[PDB]
Design a protein around this ligand. Structure first.
Ligand SMILES: O=C(O)[C@@H]1CCCO1
Ligand SMILES: O=C(O)[C@@H]1CCCO1
Ligand SMILES: O=C(O)[C@@H]1CCCO1
Ligand SMILES: O=C(O)[C@@H]1CCCO1
Ligand SMILES: O=C(O)[C@@H]1CCCO1
Ligand SMILES: [Cl-]
Ligand SMILES: [Cl-]
Lengths: 277, 273, 279, 273, 279
C-alpha cells in the first residue's frame, strides 16, 4: 500500500514477454517508476521492445549498460542463452548486484560457478514466474543462492508480491513449479479456447462464449483461493443431483480429463529438467 | 433502488452466494433480504441466518416482503412454487427465475392465470458471485419494462459480469458458465495432483494452480489478443510448455471441454422437456 | 508469372536429375531468372521421366558429374543423403574458386560437406538448404544457412535465386532439421489431406474431380488468407465457425480425433528421422 | 455497370465478400449496402470503415440493391423473406448464401408476393477476402441465363466459381464451405509442431502456410493423382514416409472424411429445423 | 489370352460408357468372344476418357440411348442406381422380344426393373448382375440372377459371356447386396491395401516402383494359391509363419489392430449401403 523502492534500479537482460510483463506489473503496482528500469535485447525491433519504450523504460542494445544501470538484475532470457550472458557480463558484476535468473531449469549452482570465475560470492536468486504478472496476478516462487543475503530474499519477495502471489521455496521444487504455475497459463488458454468452441457449438456467439468461459474460470479460482474447502467439496456443492453439471463432469471423467492435466505438469517438469542437462 | 427489498424462494447454494455477494458489494443490507425454503435445517439456511438475512418457512412472507423475487429452486419445483404464490404476485414484482432450463413462456403462463402482465426475468448465474466474480446472463420477459432490465443488470453486475442475452442462448450459457466453475474445480484438483506427483506439497500445489488459472483468465479478459495468440506468446521453442501442450493435444484435451459444455447444455434442455 | 531478375553470368548445375532438380529448373526458367540452356543436370539413370522432362525444357543433360561441375558456377547437390559422400569424393578435385556448392540433401550438415571437400581444396563455398517441389509453381518454401567460407555475396545471391520461386529466408543451420519436418515434408502432408478431403466430398455425393478442385481451392485460399492476415489462425477459424453451424460441428469431430496432435507428431517424426539420416 | 449490391446480414460472410469485391474493384465500396439487426458488431464497424453504407432496416438494403445477398443464419431466412418479400422488385436477383436453405423454399416464400422471383443459391467461403475463394451456385426456376452468367463472373473475380446441381451444395458446404477452418486448425498445429522442434513461432507459421499454399497450387496445376505426388517426394527410408506413417496411425485421412461428413450432415439439419 | 467362344449372332449394347462399360468391352474383345464393332455404347457425356478409349478399341459410339437399344440384343445397363429409372423410362418403349436387359447397377432390384419396363411391354427379359473392373484383365468376379421372364437360355448365355472375362456364377438375387459388399467393392479394398503395403516397403527403404511390383505380386500369388488349394487360408497362413520368425511378428501387429475386424466392417458397410441405394 503505497510501497515504493526509492533507490532500486532494475535491469532486464532479455526484453521479451517476461521483461515487458514484469515492467508493466511493477509500474502498474506503483512500486517502481518506468524510467528507473532498463532493458537490453539483441533484437531491438521486437514489439515487446517498442511496448517497453512507450512505457518509458530505458532501452539499450548493450547488456553492459543494463548491468551498470541496475541494482537488481533480471536474466529474462532462454535457458541456453544464460551461459552466453553470464560470460558476457560476469566481469561487470559488482558488489551491489543481485542477479535474478528467470530462465527455466537453469540452476543456481551453474549460475554461481559461471560468475564465480570472474568474481567471488555473486548474489544470485532463481525464480519461476509467469506472464499474468502483467495484470498483477502472477504466480512466483524463488530460491536464494548461497551468497544471497537475508535482505536479498525479503527484498525480492516484496518486489514480486506486488505483481501476484510470491513465496520462497527450496530450489529443488522449481522444476515442478515450472510445470504447474510456470506452464499453467498456457493450459488455461488452451482450455479457454476450447470451452468457447463448446459454447459456439451450442449456439453462443464467439465473443460471448470467450467472455463467459474466462469469467467462469476466473471466478472458480478466486473461489477456491478464498475457500477453506476442498476443490472436490466445492464441485460437490454445485453439482445438482441428476443435473446438467454432473452429466458434463461424467464425460470429462470418461475421457480422463484429470489424468491429462497430470500428464501436462509431468511432461513440462520433465522437459524442464532436460533443459538443464 | 436503495429502498429495494429482495426475496428468495429456495435458500440453497445460489441464494447464499447471491446474498453474500449482494451484501459484500454493499448494494443490499442483509436485513432487506428474505429467504424461504421447505428445509429450514440446512447449513445454507443457518449461514444466511448469521449474515443477518431474514428467514421464514412461508413463501408468502417472502413474496409480500420482496420487490425483486429470485426463484432459486430446482427446475422441477418451479411449477409448484408458481402455483403456490401465483395469487400473491403484485404489480410491483420483478420475478427472476434462476432455475436451469425453465422457459420465460412457461412462467408467464402460470403467473398469468392469477394476474395479467407478470414481470418475469430469466437468468443463469453461478456460485462465484459469492466472491463477486460471477458470470450472469439474463433475458427479459414480455412484460419486463426496460427499467426492469436496467435494474437487473445493475444488481447482478455488482457481483460479477452481467449482460443481457436472447433467451434461446441460456441453455448454452448454462453448459458453459453455469457448469463451468465445476469444470475448473476438477482442473485445479487434478493440476494439484500433478504438482504433488512431481514433488510439491499439496498446499503449495493447490495455491499455484489456482493462481495460475486466475491470472490466465484475468490476463485474457484484459487482452485484445486471441487466446491461441497468448498460448503462442508464452510457448518457447522446444521448451517445457510446448511439450506439455503436446501431451494435452494427444489426449484430445480440447474436445473433452467441448464435450462437457455440449453435455451440460443438452441435459439442461432435457430438464425443461 | 516472372521475377524481375536475370542472373546473366550464372551457369547452374544439378547433380541428381530427379524431382527436386526438375522442379527448380522449371521454376527458375518460368520465373525468367535463368535460361534453360544455362542449366546443366547429370544423373546415374538417364532414362528417368524427370530427365526426359528436363530435355524437353531445353536443359543440358550429361551422364558425367564432372561435366556438370565444369559447366556450373552454382552447383546444386540434389541427391539423397547417403549419396552425398560419394558425390563429394567423385568431384571434390574438380571444385574451383568460383563454385558455390548448394547441398539440398536432408540432414547432411555443412561441417561434413566442408570436411569432405577440404581434403581436395581448402575453403569450399558451401550452402545448405531445404526447399520443396512447389518451387515448380513458384510457391516453394526455402531456408538456407551459409557455410564457413561462403562469402556475404554467396548467401545474398542464393536468396535472390531461391526467392524467385517461392518464400526464402536465411536460418541458423541448427533449425534446418526442424524446417525439414515442417515445410520440407509439409506438401506431402497436404497431398494426403487433399486426397482425404476429396474422399469425404465423394462420400457425400460430390464427383471426384469437383471434390479435388474444391478441396485444393479451400487450402490454397486459407493458406493465402493467413499469409496476408494480421490475425492468429484461431481467430480466422473463429470467423468461419457460425454458432451452432456446420463448420463447428466438423471441427469438434476433428478435435475428438486429436487432429492437431497428429500434425504435431508428424513434424516431430520427420525432424527426428532427419537427424538420424546423418548420424 | 450501374450495379448496386446489398447484404442482408452484416456478419463475417458479407464482410469478406464486400472486402473481396472492392479489392477486385468490381464495384465501389459505397455501392454496397448492408443491414444488420445489431449495429454494434465489429463486422458492422469494419464494413463501415471500408466505406460500405450501413442501415438497420432491411427494406432500405432491398430498395438500394440490384443483386441482393442473403447472408444470415439459415433459420433467420424465412423471417427475412416475410419482411422484405413485398419489397422485392422485378430487377432483383436474390442470392441466398445460407447453409442448407433450398432454392425451393425461398421461391415459395417470395412467390406469395410477386411471380417469378429470381433466386440463386450459392456456397462460398472467407478466402474471397484475398480473391481466392471457392464458390458454387445453382440457379432457380426463374433466373435467366444472364443471371447465372452475371453471378459466375461476379464471384469469379474473387476466386474459383462454377455452376453445380443444387443437390451437391450441402456436400460442397462440408468441403470448401467449412474447408478453410480445417486448414486454419491444420496450420496452427503444424506451427506448434515446428515450435516443438525448436522453430520460432513466426517462422513456423510462415513455413507451414507456404507449404500448404504451394502444395494446393501444385495439385491444381498437376495432371497427377495427389497420391502420386505424395509418392514422388517420399524418399525410401526418409523423413517424410516416417511422418506419413504417424499420420496414418492416427486415422488422419478418416478424421478429414468425418469432418466433411459432419459438416454436410449438419448443413442438412439446419434446413430441416 | 482367349476363350474358345464366339457369339456370332450377338450384338451388345452399353447404356453408360464409363469404367464398367469399357472394362467389359475390353475384356470381351480381348477374350475374342466378340468383335468390337458388334458392341455399341452410349453416354450423356461423350468427352469422357472412357468414351475415347472405347473409340480407340473400335466400339460403336452414339449419343442416343435409343440407337444403342435398336443396335443390341444383349443390353447392359451400366449406369448408376439413381439413373436406372430415367433410363428405363427413356427406352422402355423401344424394348423388343429379342432384348435381354442386363442391369449392372448396385442395389437396383429385378422387381423394380421389371415393374418399370412392364408399363411399356409385358414379360421383359431382365438379368441383374454384379461384376467388377478386373474383367478388363479377364479376372473379374461376377454373379447374376435371372428375372421373372428370363428364359433358361438367357442365363446360360449370360454365364457364357461373363465367364469369358473372369469367374461367374448364378445366385439368388437376395445374395447380390452382400456380393456387392465383397467382390463388387473388393478391388477397392485391394487397391488401398496395395498402396499401403508399398508405403510400408518404402518406409523400409524399397523404391516405390519395386515395392508396388512386389506387393501386387504377393497378393496375386496368394489369391491364386488359395483358389487352387484344398486348404483353409489359415493353414496356408500357418505354412508361411516360421516359428519365431518375421511373418508371425508381423501377423501379431495386424491382429493387435483388429485387421480382420476392419475387413468384416468393410463388407458389412458396403452391403448395408447397397441396400439403402434402392430404398
Ligand atoms: O447442475 C445443474 O443442473 C445446474 C446448472 C448449472 C448449475 O447447476
Ligand atoms: O515454455 C517454457 O519452457 C517456459 C517455462 C515456463 C514458461 O516458458
Ligand atoms: O458454419 C456454417 O454453418 C457456415 C457454412 C459453412 C461456413 O459457415
Ligand atoms: O522424405 C525425405 O526424406 C525428404 C524430405 C524432404 C524431401 O524428401
Ligand atoms: O517368417 C519368416 O521368418 C520367413 C521369411 C518370410 C517368410 O518366412
Ligand atoms: Cl515437396
Ligand atoms: Cl472394381
Amino acid at each position: 500500500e503505497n510501497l515504493y523502492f526509492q533507490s532500486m534500479s532494475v535491469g532486464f537482460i532479455g526484453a521479451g514477454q517476461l521483461a515487458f510483463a514484469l515492467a508493466k506489473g511493477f509500474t502498474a503496482a506503483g512500486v517502481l517508476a518506468a524510467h528507473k528500469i532498463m532493458a537490453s535485447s539483441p533484437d531491438m525491433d521486437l514489439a515487446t521492445v517498442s511496448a517497453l519504450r512507450k512505457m518509458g523504460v530505458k532501452l539499450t542494445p548493450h547488456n553492459k549498460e543494463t548491468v551498470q544501470h541496475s541494482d537488481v538484475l533480471f536474466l529474462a532470457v532462454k535457458p541456453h542463452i544464460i551461459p552466453f550472458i553470464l560470460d558476457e557480463i560476469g566481469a561487470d558484476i559488482e558488489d551491489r548486484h543481485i542477479v535474478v535468473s528467470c530462465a527455466a531449469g537453469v540452476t543456481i549452482s551453474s549460475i554461481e560457478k559461471k560468475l564465480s570465475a570472474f568474481r567471488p560470492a555473486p548474489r544470485v536468486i532463481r525464480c519461476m514466474t509467469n506472464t499474468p504478472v502483467v495484470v498483477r496476478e502472477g504466480a512466483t516462487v524463488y530460491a536464494t543462492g548461497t551468497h544471497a543475503q537475508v535482505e536479498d530474499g525479503r527484498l525480492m519477495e516484496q518486489l514480486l508480491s506486488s505483481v501476484g502471489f510470491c513465496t520462497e521455496v527450496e530450489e529443488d521444487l522449481i522444476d515442478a513449479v515450472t510445470g504447474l504455475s510456470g506452464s499453467g497459463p498456457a493450459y488455461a488458454f488452451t482450455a479457454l479456447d476450447a470451452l468457447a468452441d463448446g459454447g459456439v457449438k451450442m449456439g453462443l456467439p464467439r465473443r460471448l462464449a470467450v467472455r463467459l468461459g474466462a469469467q467462469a474460470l476466473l471466478g472458480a479460482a478466486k473461489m477456491l483461493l478464498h475457500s477453506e474447502q476442498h476443490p472436490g467439496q466445492l464441485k460437490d456443492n454445485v453439482s445438482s443431483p441428476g443435473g446438467a453439471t454432473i452429466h458434463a463432469l461424467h464425460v470429462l471423467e470418461s475421457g480422463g480429463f484429470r489424468s491429462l492435466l497430470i500428464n501436462a505438469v509431468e511432461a513440462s517438469c520433465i522437459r524442464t529438467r532436460e533443459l538443464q542437462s
